[PDB]
């Protein structure tokens, strides 16, 4: 990250062994379940591109996923170099990725006025690649999630929203899915209660009504 | 592209 | 959180990996038993809305509960936008939730004079949603808690107050419950001792009297 | 509402 | 706790996740064995009332004991409001408990000259309630502790002083108990050696004499 | 009294 | 590492016990699997040559690998002393290795303007030796990696890229390997799908197409 | 401990939860084996009497030993009040023990010029009591330690010096014990080698000579 | 260690509980395997003699080895008092060992200009004694290390260099040992390959050639 | 004496 | 010598 | 060479 030096001006400070051990543990345990993206973004707060690259390099195994990540960052960086023309200099996409700049340039861009926040721009590209990975590691479509005849309605809500969180579809589709699919894919007992409530109920009303049903 | 297939993140 | 910068003025500092690991552990272990709310509020001291959102996003599983939380924050944020008119700007409910503001605006509001404490306002909404969740994860009404004929009176006090802590009812009702239900739902041996004490005894007197009864 | 059903806390 | 800000003047800093995890572990493991009071007081050094309330709220289970604590703090706070008249303002008992004041008022009182040490006053009330709890969780009177015919004299000293530490009685009675009961409740072999030493011996002399007896 | 029976320490 | 002193100027600070314990754990567990190089470089950020030597000396066992490392650093240091002539002084290769300089000279060189970054120069030589070690501890050529008739295409991508990351060959050869060998060494079912896609597909397209094939 | 405040002048800072947990673990595990005294003194560096009392109060169990400690501190404090007359004030023995002074007085005495180092004076009394305890928990006289006919000479040196470290006797006696008893109590094979070396050999010569004997 | 005070000038700061716990763990686990010396020197960076003595006193068990250490420090300190005449004062050998000086004198000597680095001088004597201990705890001469007929050549290199690291002999002898003994003590298959390479090969060439031989 | 038998270290 | 056999490192 | 075979990294 960047922090205030002895002179008060901002300077880089190393990503701690505890943060790296935490990230390594996160990816070793949770294997691109969607909470890995919030955990990455929380662990990587204020990170320079060198800190982001350090986190991603410490990932052991998962090398198919990490190649899907690198080809995404290539696609995002090429889009950046298509978007931004050529005239601190303006960073090229390879500079934002930390591939063609020093760390001193990254401190420069991140501390300029107005800032050129290469740490956040690059973290957006990494998170967009981690998204593509998480949706591919998700084994089921939201269309596949149904409640069993003997399954509690809370364990179906938990499976449904845990799957919905990993869907690609736009927020208009996720809204429609929560309203229509949550009613329709419940088992006939619970679905009868949810049809007696109707389309207008909140998730609290639907869960408290189907409690023990 | 900035990140080649066998290459680590951030390159050399 | 927010902390003093090199210039002495307040600036944001990242929620630590140890705090996030602690929160993840809390929600993984304790599954909205009521102590999760004090633990959340202690772990989230001085948190900006970005820090609060970071804590809630790292919750793996529990996605039915987390949707009950988001619909609560929507209800609280809509009430805020009903309460506060439109004229730092005054934050909208979506700004307090951190959904439509930068972190810089949140530092602005939290360091203004007088403060506009968006971190505490939002933490109130989150805690009010965690309350609704905790009362729903609580499996028994306080009316259901009774002492067994072979059950120690301290293990009944522990079950009773652990249930009472998760009741929705107003403090006037909880007061009446502690006085009347604590006497009435004891087993007939212990209840005989508690009726011999009467309504006026303290919880220490009731427990020391029923000790080994 | 500020927090849509499938959306993470804090939005995009 | 309170600590020096960037301006050098005192300001609040959050009770750390490591301190809260330590306290939660202490109460989960040690269940109001008397060392919980020194551990509480060591973990709670320099605590504001908000920090004390945060520690006590994180206690999971033990809800019978925690109600004995709240009724004690009510009794102590009522005694304070009986003791102190009404004229920073002077804090009411409910303000010292952190129930009717901001944290800013608690920083005010704790940093005033002379200090009004609401953090220590309240920690005295909490420790006095934890005392009442510890004496109730102690299963044996000091009158019940005796040495077995086959029991080493050091394991009886350990049981005796561990019980004596949890007695209510005044220090004059504890002095008399150490002198008279330590001799009288020993098994007849060891008690014969202790009567051959007499009333005047130190605990080192009594233990070294009864060593292997 | 400042701390009611069902109430958390420190109140609301 | 080097950090700002009380006088604001840079001075050395000791490599922490947590960093050394982390490095010892890394080398004890992961035994020169390629992630050991990013972990070394992350743990060794801002390290002086004395800090680098301290990390390498704490490696227990692996003494064949550590001799391959010392003979590499000898080769790199001899190349440096061939490259740089003789005129702070300019550091000799033995000075960059920390073998013939004080730590004060290393602080001198690292804080000079322009810097003479002996910590990074030496970390390059160490990482180049760790590379030679990692490629020797890698048990299989990339030519040996093939998909089994019953093996999922993602577990073959993972084995392939985990092997490719440890190949010596130039990036032109690794590019050719990813394109040609990834298609050719797949099992005939999956290879049929990859030949139906052709040479132009991304790794995401190849994996999603061969999913469950 | 005491540390520099925002004003640079010394002020108290709380003994950390990690230090208290370490001390509790030390006394729970190692039960007054002699290394507990160096561990106490290392953990208690710069401690005020309030910090020392906090460490000793957190000791669970061992209440016979802790009473031997309190009667020692009484004896040392009475000797101090015999030694020092009555004229910051000069601290009485009860003030050095932290029993009759504020912490502010302890900061006063420890920061005065010349210092009145009540933290070290009291730590001497505590360590002198821990010594009496350690010698009583030691189960064997140094006269009892002998080498078995089948016992390696290094495991006898280890038992001998681990016992010698807990002897009461003066350093003149410990010197004589190392010379005479180390030769005399060895088994006849090893003792023959040690008599062939004679009285003048170092412990390295005696161990290397008896190696595998 | 010594660190900058509030006044910017250097002052002592206590060796942390985490460093002491790490050292205790190191000596408990690794029992003077040679990596204990780099671990000691890394954990003891910037240590005063009081910090060094604190580390060595916390060693539980190993009391034969710790006496070999004390007699070494006596020998080194006597050599120092033979080397340095008598005229801050110049420290005597007993002062460098921390046996006859305050900690204030050690801060004095370590912060003087030019420094009198009693912490490093004493750490040299301790490391020279730990060397004598490590060579005695090493169970095999380098002349004893041979490759088995069924033993991989890398597991013989690992045994050989792990033994060589603990040899007393001069670096001229260790050089000759690596060249001549590494070839000669290999099993006849591997030794045939090493004789086909000849004396000139690097350790990488010898290991890659004997790979799977 | 400053430390009575049943009393914690440091007294009240 | 500065460190006697039974004595801890650093003496009294 | 700066690092001899039996020698620790950084030499004496």
Author numbering:
A (entry chain A), C (entry chain A), E (entry chain A), G (entry chain A), H (entry chain A), I (entry chain A): 1 to 87, 96 to 221
B (entry chain B), D (entry chain B), F (entry chain B), J (entry chain B), K (entry chain B), L (entry chain B): 1 to 12
What does the paper say about this structure?
pmcThe mature HIV-1 capsid is a conical, fullerene shell that encompasses the viral genome. The surface of the conical capsid is dense in protein-binding sites that mediate interactions with host machinery necessary for transport of the capsid through the cytoplasm into the nucleus. Here, we present structures at 2.6 to 3.5 Å resolution of CA hexamers and pentamers within in vitro assembled conical CA-IP6 polyhedra from multiple lattice contexts differing in local curvature and geometry, alone or in the presence of Nup153-, CPSF6-, or Sec24C-derived peptides.
To investigate what effect the hexamer–pentamer switch and the tilt switch have on host–protein binding, we next repeated our structural analysis on cores incubated with FG repeat containing peptides Nup153(1407-1429), CPSF6(276-290), and Sec24C(228-242). We determined structures of hexamers from peptide-bound cores to nominal resolutions of 2.6 Å, 3.1 Å, and 3.1 Å and associated pentamers to 3.1 Å, 3.5 Å, and 3.2 Å, respectively. Within all three hexamer reconstructions, we observe unambiguous density for the corresponding peptides, which adopt structures essentially identical to previously reported crystal structures. FG repeat–containing host factors are diverse in their cellular distribution and function and include: Nup153, a nuclear pore complex component; Sec24C, a member of the COPII complex implicated in intracellular vesicle trafficking; and the nuclear-localized CPSF6 (25, 26). This is the same conformation as seen in the average unbound apo hexamer. The FG motifs in Sec24C and CPSF6 adopt a more compact structure and do not interact with these CA residues.
